[PDB]
Design a protein around this ligand. Structure first.
Ligand SMILES: [Cl-]
Lengths: 120, 113
């Protein structure tokens, strides 16, 4: 019974920073990479990237390297996604996801998602 | 965002008991260097996060009803639902994890009406 619990929704002003957490339970945090997906209004899903939980090294997909940053707290089995200099384009629901055999080939377990809304 | 995954149709208004079919076309072939085709279908029910239904093109995931089946060639894959039930409402997405970066289709909305 793998469980990925994310932090609550965030209502942020442009230019501010937001840090989303994803608490993993019932499996060794450092045995699987943590992936992050961005679900934009409308439902489109875009892969953000992944963090190697054993080495704490991040890998990002198309342009995400800019203002997004992955981090970990292995002692608390928690992964974090931080977005700096928030822009309107960041408005979306972000998901942390774990794969089947740590090959990033099959996304099996998903957190409930964290909606980030950038206002005026 | 490189391999484009296009789904057809974008909106699937249906009625209970009826069959349902969702097409997904990739802009390139999606066979992993290891010979496997990591084409999965996900269903995101209202108020829930996406959940895996089919992996490796046609393998049903645990607990997935037999009403769900998948097929597909090189750049064209299909998800079929023999009989649509109320619990099938939601958005369906195809996904390829064969080539980096993994990509998702834009989503097909299955609505009963
Ligand atoms: Cl995997």
């Amino acid at each position: 019974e793998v469980q990925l619990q994310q932090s609550g929704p965030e209502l942020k002003k442009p230019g501010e920073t937001v840090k989303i957490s994803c608490k993993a339970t019932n499996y060794a945090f450092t045995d699987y990479s943590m992936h992050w997906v961005k679900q934009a209004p409308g439902g489109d899903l875009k892969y953000v990237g992944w963090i190697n939980t054993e080495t704490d090294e991040p890998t990002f997909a198309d342009d995400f390297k800019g203002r997004f940053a992955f981090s970990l707290d292995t002692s608390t089995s928690t992964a974090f996604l931080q977005i700096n200099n928030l822009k309107n384009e960041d408005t979306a629901t972000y998901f942390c996801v774990r794969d089947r055999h740590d090959y990033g080939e099959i996304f099996t377990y998903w957190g409930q998602g964290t909606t980030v809304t950038v206002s005026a | 965002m490189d391999i484009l995954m296009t789904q057809t149709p974008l909106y699937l208004p249906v009625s209970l008991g009826d069959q349902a079919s969702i097409s997904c076309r990739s802009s390139q072939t999606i066979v992993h260097n290891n010979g496997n085709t990591y084409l999965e279908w996900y269903l995101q029910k209202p108020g829930q996060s996406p959940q895996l239904l089919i992996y490796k093109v046609s393998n049903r995931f645990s607990g997935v009803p037999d009403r769900f089946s998948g097929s597909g060639s090189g750049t064209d894959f299909t998800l079929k639902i023999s009989r649509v039930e109320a619990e099938d409402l939601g958005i369906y997405y195809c996904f390829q994890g064969s080539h980096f970066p993994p990509t998702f289709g834009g989503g097909t909305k299955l609505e009963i009406a």
